Amino acid sequence: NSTATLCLGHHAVPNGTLVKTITNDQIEVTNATELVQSSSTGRICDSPHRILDGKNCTLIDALLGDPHCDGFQNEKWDLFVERSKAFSNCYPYDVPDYASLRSLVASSGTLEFINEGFNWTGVTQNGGSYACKRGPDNSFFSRLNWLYKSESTYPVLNVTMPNNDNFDKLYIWGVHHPSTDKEQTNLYVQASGRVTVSTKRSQQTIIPNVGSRPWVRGLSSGISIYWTIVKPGDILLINSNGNLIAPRGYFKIRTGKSSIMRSDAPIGTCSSECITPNGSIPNDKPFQNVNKITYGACPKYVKQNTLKLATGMRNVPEAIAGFIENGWEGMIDGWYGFRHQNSEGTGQAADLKSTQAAIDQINGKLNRVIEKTNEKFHQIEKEFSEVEGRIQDLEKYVEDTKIDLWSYNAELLVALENQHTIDLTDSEMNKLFEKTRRQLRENAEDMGNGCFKIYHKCDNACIGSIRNGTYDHDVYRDEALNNRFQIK
Amino acid sequence: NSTATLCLGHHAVPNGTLVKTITNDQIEVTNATELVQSSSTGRICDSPHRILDGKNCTLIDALLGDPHCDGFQNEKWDLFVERSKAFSNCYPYDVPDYASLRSLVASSGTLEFINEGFNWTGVTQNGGSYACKRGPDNSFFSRLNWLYKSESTYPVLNVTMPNNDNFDKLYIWGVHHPSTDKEQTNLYVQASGRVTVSTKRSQQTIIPNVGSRPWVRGLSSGISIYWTIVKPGDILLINSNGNLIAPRGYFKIRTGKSSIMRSDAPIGTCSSECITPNGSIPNDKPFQNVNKITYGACPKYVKQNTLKLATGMRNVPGAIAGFIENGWEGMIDGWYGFRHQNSEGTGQAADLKSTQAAIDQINGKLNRVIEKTNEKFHQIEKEFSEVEGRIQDLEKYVEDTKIDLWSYNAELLVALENQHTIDLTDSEMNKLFEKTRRQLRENAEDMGNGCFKIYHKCDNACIGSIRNGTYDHDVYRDEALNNRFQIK
Amino acid sequence: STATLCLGHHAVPNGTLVKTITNDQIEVTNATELVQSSSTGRICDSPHRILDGKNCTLIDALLGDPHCDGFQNEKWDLFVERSKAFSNCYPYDVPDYASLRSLVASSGTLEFINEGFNWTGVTQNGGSYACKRGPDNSFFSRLNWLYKSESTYPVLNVTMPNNDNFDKLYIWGVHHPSTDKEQTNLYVQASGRVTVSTKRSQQTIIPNVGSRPWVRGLSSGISIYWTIVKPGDILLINSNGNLIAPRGYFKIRTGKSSIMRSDAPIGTCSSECITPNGSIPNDKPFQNVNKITYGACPKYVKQNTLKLATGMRNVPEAIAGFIENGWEGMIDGWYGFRHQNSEGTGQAADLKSTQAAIDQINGKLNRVIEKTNEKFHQIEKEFSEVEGRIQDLEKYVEDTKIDLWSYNAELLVALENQHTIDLTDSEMNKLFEKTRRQLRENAEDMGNGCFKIYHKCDNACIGSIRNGTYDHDVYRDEALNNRFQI
Ligand SMILES: *[C@@H]1O[C@H](CO)[C@@H](O[C@@H]2O[C@H](CO)[C@@H](O[C@@H]3O[C@H](CO)[C@@H](O)[C@H](O)[C@@H]3O)[C@H](O)[C@H]2NC(C)=O)[C@H](O)[C@H]1NC(C)=O
Ligand SMILES: *[C@@H]1O[C@H](CO)[C@@H](O[C@@H]2O[C@H](CO)[C@@H](O[C@@H]3O[C@H](CO)[C@@H](O)[C@H](O)[C@@H]3O)[C@H](O)[C@H]2NC(C)=O)[C@H](O)[C@H]1NC(C)=O
Ligand SMILES: *[C@@H]1O[C@H](CO)[C@@H](O[C@@H]2O[C@H](CO)[C@@H](O[C@@H]3O[C@H](CO)[C@@H](O)[C@H](O)[C@@H]3O)[C@H](O)[C@H]2NC(C)=O)[C@H](O)[C@H]1NC(C)=O
Numbered sequence A: 001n002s003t004a005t006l007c008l009g010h011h012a013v014p015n016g017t018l019v020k021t022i023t024n025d026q027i028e029v030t031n032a033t034e035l036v037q038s039s040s041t042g043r044i045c046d047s048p049h050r051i052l053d054g055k056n057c058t059l060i061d062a063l064l065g066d067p068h069c070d071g072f073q074n075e076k077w078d079l080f081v082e083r084s085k086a087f088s089n090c091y092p093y094d095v096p097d098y099a100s101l102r103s104l105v106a107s108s109g110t111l112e113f114i115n116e117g118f119n120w121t122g123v124t125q126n127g128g129s130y131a132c133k134r135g136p137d138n139s140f141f142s143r144l145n146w147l148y149k150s151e152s153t154y155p156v157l158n159v160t161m162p163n164n165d166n167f168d169k170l171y172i173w174g175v176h177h178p179s180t181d182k183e184q185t186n187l188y189v190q191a192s193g194r195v196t197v198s199t200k201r202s203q204q205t206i207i208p209n210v211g212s213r214p215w216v217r218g219l220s221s222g223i224s225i226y227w228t229i230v231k232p233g234d235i236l237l238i239n240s241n242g243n244l245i246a247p248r249g250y251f252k253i254r255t256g257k258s259s260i261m262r263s264d265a266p267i268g269t270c271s272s273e274c275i276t277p278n279g280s281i282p283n284d285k286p287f288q289n290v291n292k293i294t295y296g297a298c299p300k301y302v303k304q305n306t307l308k309l310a311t312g313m314r315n316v317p318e319a320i321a322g323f324i325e326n327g328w329e330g331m332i333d334g335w336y337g338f339r340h341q342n343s344e345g346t347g348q349a350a351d352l353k354s355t356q357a358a359i360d361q362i363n364g365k366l367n368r369v370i371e372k373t374n375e376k377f378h379q380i381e382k383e384f385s386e387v388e389g390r391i392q393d394l395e396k397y398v399e400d401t402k403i404d405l406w407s408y409n410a411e412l413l414v415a416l417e418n419q420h421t422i423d424l425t426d427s428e429m430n431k432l433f434e435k436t437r438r439q440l441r442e443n444a445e446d447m448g449n450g451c452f453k454i455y456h457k458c459d460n461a462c463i464g465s466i467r468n469g470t471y472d473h474d475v476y477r478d479e480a481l482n483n484r485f486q487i488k
Numbered sequence B: 001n002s003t004a005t006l007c008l009g010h011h012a013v014p015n016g017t018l019v020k021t022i023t024n025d026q027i028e029v030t031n032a033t034e035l036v037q038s039s040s041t042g043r044i045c046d047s048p049h050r051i052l053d054g055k056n057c058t059l060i061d062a063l064l065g066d067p068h069c070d071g072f073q074n075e076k077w078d079l080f081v082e083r084s085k086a087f088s089n090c091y092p093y094d095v096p097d098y099a100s101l102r103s104l105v106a107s108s109g110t111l112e113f114i115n116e117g118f119n120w121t122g123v124t125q126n127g128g129s130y131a132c133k134r135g136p137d138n139s140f141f142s143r144l145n146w147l148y149k150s151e152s153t154y155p156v157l158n159v160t161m162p163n164n165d166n167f168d169k170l171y172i173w174g175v176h177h178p179s180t181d182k183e184q185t186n187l188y189v190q191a192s193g194r195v196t197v198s199t200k201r202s203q204q205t206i207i208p209n210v211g212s213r214p215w216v217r218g219l220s221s222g223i224s225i226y227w228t229i230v231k232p233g234d235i236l237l238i239n240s241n242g243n244l245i246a247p248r249g250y251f252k253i254r255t256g257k258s259s260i261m262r263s264d265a266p267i268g269t270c271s272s273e274c275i276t277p278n279g280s281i282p283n284d285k286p287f288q289n290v291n292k293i294t295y296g297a298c299p300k301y302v303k304q305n306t307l308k309l310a311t312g313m314r315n316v317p318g319a320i321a322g323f324i325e326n327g328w329e330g331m332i333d334g335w336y337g338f339r340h341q342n343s344e345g346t347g348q349a350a351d352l353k354s355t356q357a358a359i360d361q362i363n364g365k366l367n368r369v370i371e372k373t374n375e376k377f378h379q380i381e382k383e384f385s386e387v388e389g390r391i392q393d394l395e396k397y398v399e400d401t402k403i404d405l406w407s408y409n410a411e412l413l414v415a416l417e418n419q420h421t422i423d424l425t426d427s428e429m430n431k432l433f434e435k436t437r438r439q440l441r442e443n444a445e446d447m448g449n450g451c452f453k454i455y456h457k458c459d460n461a462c463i464g465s466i467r468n469g470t471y472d473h474d475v476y477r478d479e480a481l482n483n484r485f486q487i488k
Numbered sequence C: 001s002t003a004t005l006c007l008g009h010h011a012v013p014n015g016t017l018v019k020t021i022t023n024d025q026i027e028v029t030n031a032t033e034l035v036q037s038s039s040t041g042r043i044c045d046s047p048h049r050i051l052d053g054k055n056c057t058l059i060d061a062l063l064g065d066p067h068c069d070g071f072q073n074e075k076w077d078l079f080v081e082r083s084k085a086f087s088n089c090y091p092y093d094v095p096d097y098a099s100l101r102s103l104v105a106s107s108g109t110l111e112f113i114n115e116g117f118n119w120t121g122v123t124q125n126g127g128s129y130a131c132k133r134g135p136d137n138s139f140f141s142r143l144n145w146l147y148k149s150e151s152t153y154p155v156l157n158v159t160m161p162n163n164d165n166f167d168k169l170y171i172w173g174v175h176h177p178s179t180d181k182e183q184t185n186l187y188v189q190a191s192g193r194v195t196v197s198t199k200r201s202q203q204t205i206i207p208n209v210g211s212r213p214w215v216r217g218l219s220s221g222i223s224i225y226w227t228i229v230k231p232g233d234i235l236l237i238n239s240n241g242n243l244i245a246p247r248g249y250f251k252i253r254t255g256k257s258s259i260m261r262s263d264a265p266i267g268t269c270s271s272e273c274i275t276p277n278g279s280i281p282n283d284k285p286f287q288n289v290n291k292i293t294y295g296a297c298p299k300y301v302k303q304n305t306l307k308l309a310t311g312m313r314n315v316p317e318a319i320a321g322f323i324e325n326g327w328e329g330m331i332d333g334w335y336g337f338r339h340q341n342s343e344g345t346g347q348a349a350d351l352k353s354t355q356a357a358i359d360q361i362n363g364k365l366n367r368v369i370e371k372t373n374e375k376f377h378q379i380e381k382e383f384s385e386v387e388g389r390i391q392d393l394e395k396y397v398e399d400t401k402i403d404l405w406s407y408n409a410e411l412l413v414a415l416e417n418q419h420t421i422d423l424t425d426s427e428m429n430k431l432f433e434k435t436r437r438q439l440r441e442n443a444e445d446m447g448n449g450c451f452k453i454y455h456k457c458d459n460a461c462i463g464s465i466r467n468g469t470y471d472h473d474v475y476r477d478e479a480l481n482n483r484f485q486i
C-alpha cells in the first residue's frame, strides 16, 4: 500500500524448439531456423544457366557426330545434362581416357567446330558404313573423315595444319581396327597400318589391331578415339600409312563456367542458381544434404540432415515474479519488459530498446550465415560406374575429406553460434535489470526473484517514468528512506 | 552487538595442470584430460575386423597363385596385412600399374576365384617351369594358364567369354617375354607374338619383347601382368598369336569395407576398432598422433602430441576469506561452498547445486568431444617406396592438407573449450555469490573479498538457513539496520 | 561536502572498423591486418639457395643443352624457371614432362655420375648441326647418340647394376628419324626398338620415321624417357636401333627442394617466404599474394583484408563515466578514474586493469602471429596446357584447401574480435565493481558510471581508492550523516 513491485522479465512461447550448444545437446529456445537444405523440387530449372539436355546423346557422341546427335552440331551450354537412356548408334568405338576428353569438352562448353582443308591427296575421303546410317544412307561420324585407298594404293600421308590463331584447337581423330586381314588390305593396302599424330610437344602413335574388337551392332570392328590439343604457334602433323580416321577441323576450346552433370531429372521453366542431379535446390541456407554433386551458387554439402540455428532466447514457460523464476508467455509486443503491481493494480509493458538490441545481434549473425555465395562450376566426378584403382581412390578420398571438414565446420558453427545467442539474450535481460536497479538508487530493494520492491507509492505514471528512463529518484527519496529504514 | 562473517569460495588442488586457452598459453586448472592418443600396444587385435596375415605373401602373389601362397586361395579379409618379409618364388613377373591392381583387389576383400572353360583348341595348356616348383614338379601360377604350341603350330586365337552375371568379373592375364629368339619360336612358332585382350569398352594390346627382362632366379625372362574388368552385359575377347598367359577364370569383385595395410606388428587375441601399422590403438580420444595410416573407427590424426582439455576450474592455491583471494584446498566435498565465523566458531560446507551445475556442463562438453566416431576403411596410400612424380605429389599433398586442417581444428577446439570451461566455472561462483547477496537483503554488507559481514547475531542454524536458502531476512532486519546505521 | 568519482575507458578520434560474430562493422580503438597483400617484387637470395634458370628450363639443364652447360651438377633449394627460357639443341619431346620436371625439382640436384656402359658394336657420340657446342656439331651432354659401326648395328644387351644404397635416375631417349634413308643410314635396321628394363618395370618404345614436325632445321626429334633404379636392382637396355643412351645417372636426393615459375628479379635480402610475385613478409598468418609459395609462408586465403581488433570498442567523447561514452583525453591507460573533489578535478589511468586487457590481447596475438607453416615441394597450381582428369583433380584439391582456410580465417577473426570486445568490456565492469565494493556505505552509484562519495574526499583520499587502500570505516559516520537526511 505504501510500496509497489516492479518485475523485469522476458517472453516465452508455448511451442519452443530444441537446439544444440557447446554445453548442451538439447536446450529449448523460442525460435530457430534450419541451416541444411534437404529437399528438392525434382526439376532442373532452365534459368539462369544455359541448360542443354543431351536426351539420347552423350556429350562424346554429340562431339564425334553420331547421326542421331546431328541436332547438337555447334551447340553450347553452361550445363550439359547427360541422361542414362543415352545410346550410341554409329560405328563401334572406344575412347582410351574417355573421362578426360568428356571433362575437357564439358568444361569448354561448346561444340563449335571449324572445318579445315586438310590436303588428303592420294587417298579417298568420306568412307561410310551401314553400321552408321544417317537417314537412309550409309554414313559416318560427322566430324571424322574415314580415309581409305585410292587407285589401289594408300601412300604414307604426311599432312600438317598450323595453329596460326590465338586459341587452343581441339582435334579429334581415330584409328580403325578392322575385323579381318582381308578388310585391312581392301581398305588400306598395307597389311598393318599406323597412325601418328604429332605436335612440337607431343606424339601419339597407334598401331591398329586386326580382329581385336568384339561384335557390336553387326560389326566385329571398331575405331579408337584420340585427341590432340594444338596451342597457338604449334602445328598438327598427321602421318599414316593406313587406318587413319582423320579430323575435319577443330573444336574451339573456351574457358569459363561450363560443366556436365549426369541426371534423369526433368528440365522445367523456373529459375534457380543451384543445380543438383536430383533437381535444382534453393540456396538460401548455407548447407545442404541433397547431393554432393552440384553446379552453380550452392549451399555446401554436409553429412547432417538438420542443423538448427537458434534465433531467439532460452524458452522458459510460465503475485507477479520476474525472470529469475520463468519467462512470460503473455508478453507478445517485445522480448523483454516490465510487470508491475501498485495502487492501480497490475500491468505489463514491453521494453523496446533491449528487444531491438537482441534482435539486431541475432539478425547480424543470420546475415553472416545466410550470406555465403559459393559458386562452383566444373569440379571433379564424384560417382563412378567403373572399377579403376589409384586415381579413383584419390578422387573419392579428396571428396570424402572435404565433406568431413565442412560437416565439422557446420556442426561447430551452430553449437558456438547457439551458445552465443543464449548468452547475448541472457545478457540483454541482465543489463535491463541493472539499468533499472541503478535508476531506483535508494528507493527500492531487489527481492531476489527478478523484481524490485519500490518503497514509495508508485502509481502508473510513476512506473511509466521508470520504464521511460525519466524517473527522478530525488522526488521520492524521503518517502522511500522513511519506509525502508524503520525499526518497529 | 556481535556479528558474523560468511565467505563464499571454490576448491583448489595442490597438484594443478596447465592448459591452453584463447588468451593464455598456460593457465593452471584443477584437472584436465588428454585428447591425443599417442601410444599403441604394438599388436593388431584380431577382433572385431577379419584380419588376414599375408605372412610371406604379398596380396598380388596370393592373387596370381605363387605356390607358397596356395593357402590363400579363395580367402577373404577386412584387412589384409602385408609383411615386409614377403617374397616371390615363382616365375619372374612385373605388373605395370601394380598399385592400382593391389588397391582394387584389397578393396574388394576376396580372392574368390571362379574357373571358366575357355576354348583353347589349337594350343597346349598348362605350361610350367622349374622356377615355379609345386611340390617336386615344375609348375606355374595357379590362376594363370601358360599356353604354347600344339602339333608344331600356334594359330591366331580368338576366344570369348560373356559376362552374363550381375556383378563385375576381374580377369588377370599376362604376356610372356622369352629370353631368346630360340625360346620364342620353340614356344610360340611365330617370331613375335601379340596379346590383345578386349571388351566393348577397352583394348589392351601388348607386344612381347624377346630378351627384355633381367636375370631373376635363374631366368632372363618374365611375364608382365595385366587386368581387365568385364561389366555385366560386356564380353572378354582374347586374341593372340603367341606369348599369351591366359586367365583360368575370374575373381568376383565385391564392394565393402576391405582394405590392406603394410605392417610388421604381430596379430594378437584382443579386440580393438582402430588399427594402425604400429598396432591397434584405443579410440576413446578424438585425436591420435600414432600414424596417419589407419583402418576402422579411429581418432583423427593430428600433428600435436598432446592436447589437454580442462575438466575443472582455474586452480588458485585469524579470519577467513572468499574466492576473491584464492581457492580453498581444504574444501574436498564440493567445488563451491561456504565458510563462516560466528559465535559458535568456524565452519565450512559445500554447495551441492552449483557444484553439479559446473560438473554437468563440463560433462556436456566431454560427451560432445569424446563421442567422435569417424570410421574409415580403404583410403589412399600415404607412404611410398618408389619415386613417382605427379600422382604421388598429389597423394602426399592431399594428405598433408587434410592433416594440417584437422590439426588446426583440434588446436582451436581445445583453446575455445578451455576458455569456456574457465568462464562457466567462474560464472557459477559469481552466481552463488549474487544469490547469497540477494538473500541477505539489508542484513549484510559485501566486504569485497568474497565475504559478507552479517550485521546480526548469527549462530550455526542461522548460517545453515542461508546456505539452505530458507533464511528469512525480516526476522533479523531490525537488528541488522540498527548495527549497520550507527553514528558514533 | 562530497566528491564525484567516475570510472571510464579511453577512446580515440581515429577508430577502425572490424567484424564480429554479431556485427559486420563495429569500431574499435585499434586493429591489425592479418592478410599479407603486398610483395616487394624481388625474390630474396637468403636464406634459401636460389638457382636462377635464366635462359634454361630445368629439363634443358638436365639433358644438357649446350647453352645450359653452366648448370651441370648444380644444386638448389628453389629453381626459378623464367618465361624467356628457350631450347637450342636437338628437337625433343618428353611424354609426361611434368612428372620428370617435378621429381628432379624435388631432388634439388643435377649431380650426374658418369658410368662406363659397354657399347662395343656401335659408334658413340653422334651429333648434329642443330646442337652446336662451340664451332662443333654436338648433342645433349648427358645423352649418348649411338649409331652403326662397320655397317652394322647389332642387338644391344647392356646392363648397369645399382650396387649403391640410393636410387639412380636414368634419362634416355628414342630417335625418330625424318626419313627411311636417315633410319637405315644411322641404324641399318628399317625399324628400331628401344627397351629399358628393371626387375620392376619395362619401357618399350618403337621409333617412328617422319613423325616429328620441322623444328630448327630438322623434321626429326628424340623422345625422352626416364627410369629410376632402386638399390639391388639393375638397368637393362636392349635395342636394335634408335637408342639415345644414358651416360650415367643423376643422384636422387630427398629434402626441401622445389621449382617455381617466376619472372621476378633475384635480390640481395633475406626472406623466408617466396612467391612468384617476389618474397613476402611472413609476420601475418594469412596472405593474398599467390597460392603458389615456398618456405615459411602465411596461408593463402581469398580475402584481401582481415582486421583483428587489438583494442576495445571505440565510443568517442562536469564529468561522467563509461555508461555515457569513452574518454578521448585519457592517453596514459585504457581504463581510469576522473574525479571532482575539494581540491579540484583530475584524471588518472588504472594500470592493472589496463595491463590485464593488454595481456589478454597480446596472448591472442601470440597465438595468431606465431604460426610457421613451412611448405616446400607441393603440387602445381597453374597450368599452361588443357589436360582433363588429373588437372581437374589438382585444381579441385587446391580450391578446396583455399576455401577451407579462408573460412577458418574469417571465423577466427570474427570470434576473436567478439571476444576482444567482450573481455575489454568486462575489465571496465570489473573495475567499477571493485570500486563499488571498496566504498561500502560511503557512496552511491549515480547510474552514469560514477559514484557520489558522501564525504570530503581530498586527493590523498581519491588516491587511496585508486590504490585499493581506502578505509571505509574512517569516513562512514560522515558519509551516513550526509546520505540519510529526511
Ligand atoms: C572371334 O570370335 C567371336 C566369338 O565367336 C566372334 O564374335 C561373333 O561373331 C558372329 C559373326 O561374326 C556374331 O554372330 C552374329 O550374331 C547376331 C546376334 O546373335 C546375329 O544377328 C548375326 O547375324 C551374327 O550371326 C556373334 O554374335 C559374335 N559373338 C560374340 C560373342 O561376339 C568374332 O566374329 C570372331 N572374329 C573372327 C573369327 O575374326
Ligand atoms: C643380357 O646381359 C645380361 C648381363 O649383361 C645377362 O645377365 C646375366 O645372365 C647370366 C645367365 O645367362 C647370369 O648368370 C648367372 O649368375 C649367377 C650368379 O649371380 C649364377 O649363380 C648363375 O648360375 C648364372 O651363372 C648373370 O647373373 C646375369 N647378369 C646380370 C647382371 O643379371 C642376360 O642374361 C643377357 N640377356 C640375354 C637375353 O642375352
Ligand atoms: C611433312 O610435311 C611437312 C609440311 O610441309 C614438312 O614440313 C616442312 O618442311 C620443310 C623442309 O622439308 C620446311 O622448309 C623450311 O622452311 C623454313 C621457313 O621457316 C625455311 O627457312 C627453310 O630453309 C626450309 O625451306 C617447312 O618449314 C616445313 N613446314 C612445316 C609446316 O613445318 C615436313 O618436312 C614433311 N616431313 C617429311 C618427313 O617429309
Ligand SMILES: *[C@@H]1O[C@H](CO)[C@@H](O[C@@H]2O[C@H](CO)[C@@H](O)[C@H](O)[C@H]2NC(C)=O)[C@H](O)[C@H]1NC(C)=O
Residues within 6 Å of the ligand: A031, A032, A033, A311, A366
Ligand atoms: C523466427 O526466426 C526466423 C528467422 O529469423 C524469422 O524468419 C524471418 O522473418 C523475417 C520477417 O518475417 C523474414 O524477412 C526473414 O526472411 C525470415 N528468415 C528466415 C530465415 O526464415 C521469424 O520471423 C522468427 N519469428 C517467429 C517464427 O515468430
Ligand SMILES: *[C@@H]1O[C@H](CO)[C@@H](O[C@@H]2O[C@H](CO)[C@@H](O)[C@H](O)[C@H]2NC(C)=O)[C@H](O)[C@H]1NC(C)=O
Residues within 6 Å of the ligand: A038, A039, A040, A277, A278, A290, A291, A383
Ligand atoms: C538425391 O539423389 C541421391 C543420389 O541418387 C540420393 O541418394 C541415394 O539414395 C538412395 C535411397 O535413399 C540410396 O540407396 C543411395 O545409396 C543414394 N545414392 C547416393 C549416391 O548417395 C538422395 O536420396 C537424393 N536426395 C533427395 C532429397 O532427393
Ligand SMILES: *[C@@H]1O[C@H](CO)[C@@H](O[C@@H]2O[C@H](CO)[C@@H](O)[C@H](O)[C@H]2NC(C)=O)[C@H](O)[C@H]1NC(C)=O
Residues within 6 Å of the ligand: B038, B039, B040, B277, B278, B289, B290, B291, B383
Ligand atoms: C608408429 O610408426 C611410425 C611409422 O614407422 C613411426 O614414425 C617413424 O618414427 C621413426 C623414429 O621415431 C622416424 O625415423 C620415422 O621417420 C617415422 N616415420 C614416419 C612415416 O612418420 C612412429 O614413431 C610410431 N609411433 C608409435 C606410437 O609407435
Ligand SMILES: *[C@@H]1O[C@H](CO)[C@@H](O[C@@H]2O[C@H](CO)[C@@H](O)[C@H](O)[C@H]2NC(C)=O)[C@H](O)[C@H]1NC(C)=O
Residues within 6 Å of the ligand: C030, C031, C032, C310, C365
Ligand atoms: C595497435 O595494435 C598493434 C598490434 O598490437 C600495435 O603494434 C604492436 O606494437 C608493439 C609495440 O610498439 C610492437 O612490438 C609490435 O610488433 C606491434 N605489433 C604489430 C602486429 O604490429 C600498436 O602499437 C597499437 N597502436 C596503438 C596506438 O596502441
Ligand SMILES: *[C@@H]1O[C@H](CO)[C@@H](O[C@@H]2O[C@H](CO)[C@@H](O)[C@H](O)[C@H]2NC(C)=O)[C@H](O)[C@H]1NC(C)=O
Residues within 6 Å of the ligand: C054, C055
Ligand atoms: C639469354 O639468351 C640471349 C640470346 O642468346 C642472350 O642475349 C645475347 O647475349 C649475347 C652476349 O651477351 C649477345 O652477343 C647477343 O647479341 C644477345 N642476343 C640477344 C637476342 O639479345 C642473353 O644474354 C642470355 N641471358 C642470360 C642471362 O644468359
Ligand SMILES: *[C@@H]1O[C@H](CO)[C@@H](O[C@@H]2O[C@H](CO)[C@@H](O)[C@H](O)[C@H]2NC(C)=O)[C@H](O)[C@H]1NC(C)=O
Residues within 6 Å of the ligand: C118, C120, C121
Ligand atoms: C662388352 O661387350 C662386348 C661385346 O659383346 C664383349 O665382347 C666379347 O667378348 C668376348 C670375350 O670376353 C669375345 O670372345 C667376343 O669376341 C667379344 N666380342 C667382341 C666383338 O669384342 C665384351 O666381353 C664385354 N665386355 C665386358 C667388360 O664385359
Ligand SMILES: *[C@@H]1O[C@H](CO)[C@@H](O[C@@H]2O[C@H](CO)[C@@H](O)[C@H](O)[C@H]2NC(C)=O)[C@H](O)[C@H]1NC(C)=O
Residues within 6 Å of the ligand: C037, C038, C039, C276, C277, C288, C289, C290, C382
Ligand atoms: C601476383 O601475381 C599473380 C599472378 O600473376 C597476380 O594475379 C593476377 O592478377 C591479375 C589482376 O589482379 C589477373 O588478371 C590475373 O588473372 C591474376 N592471375 C592469377 C593466377 O590469379 C597477383 O595480382 C599478384 N599479386 C601481387 C600482390 O602482386
Ligand SMILES: *[C@@H]1O[C@H](CO)[C@@H](O)[C@H](O)[C@H]1NC(C)=O
Residues within 6 Å of the ligand: A013, A015, A016, A017, A030, A031, A032
Ligand atoms: C510457434 O507458433 C507460431 C504461431 O503459429 C509460429 O509462427 C512459429 O513459427 C512457431 N515457432 C516455433 C519455434 O515452432
Ligand SMILES: *[C@@H]1O[C@H](CO)[C@@H](O)[C@H](O)[C@H]1NC(C)=O
Residues within 6 Å of the ligand: A055, A056
Ligand atoms: C530417344 O530414342 C528412342 C529410340 O530411338 C526414341 O523413341 C525417342 O524418341 C528418342 N528421344 C528423343 C528425345 O529423341
Ligand SMILES: *[C@@H]1O[C@H](CO)[C@@H](O)[C@H](O)[C@H]1NC(C)=O
Residues within 6 Å of the ligand: A119, A120, A121, A122
Ligand atoms: C596436296 O599435296 C600434294 C602432295 O602429295 C601436292 O602435290 C598438291 O599440290 C597439294 N595440294 C594443295 C592444294 O596444296
Ligand SMILES: *[C@@H]1O[C@H](CO)[C@@H](O)[C@H](O)[C@H]1NC(C)=O
Residues within 6 Å of the ligand: B031, B032, B033, B311, B366
Ligand atoms: C579429472 O577429469 C577426468 C576426465 O573428466 C575425470 O574422469 C576424473 O575423475 C577427474 N579427476 C578428479 C579428481 O575429479
Ligand SMILES: *[C@@H]1O[C@H](CO)[C@@H](O)[C@H](O)[C@H]1NC(C)=O
Residues within 6 Å of the ligand: B013, B015, B016, B017, B030, B031, B032
Ligand atoms: C592429483 O592427485 C590425485 C591423487 O589422489 C589424482 O587423483 C588427481 O587426478 C591429480 N590431479 C590431476 C589434475 O591430475
Ligand SMILES: *[C@@H]1O[C@H](CO)[C@@H](O)[C@H](O)[C@H]1NC(C)=O
Residues within 6 Å of the ligand: B055, B056
Ligand atoms: C616364410 O618363409 C621362410 C623361408 O621359406 C620359412 O622358413 C617360414 O616358415 C615362412 N613363414 C611362414 C609363416 O610360412
Ligand SMILES: *[C@@H]1O[C@H](CO)[C@@H](O)[C@H](O)[C@H]1NC(C)=O
Residues within 6 Å of the ligand: B119, B120, B121
Ligand atoms: C572350340 O573351337 C574350335 C575352333 O574351330 C571348335 O572346332 C570346337 O568345336 C570348339 N570346342 C568346343 C568345346 O566348343
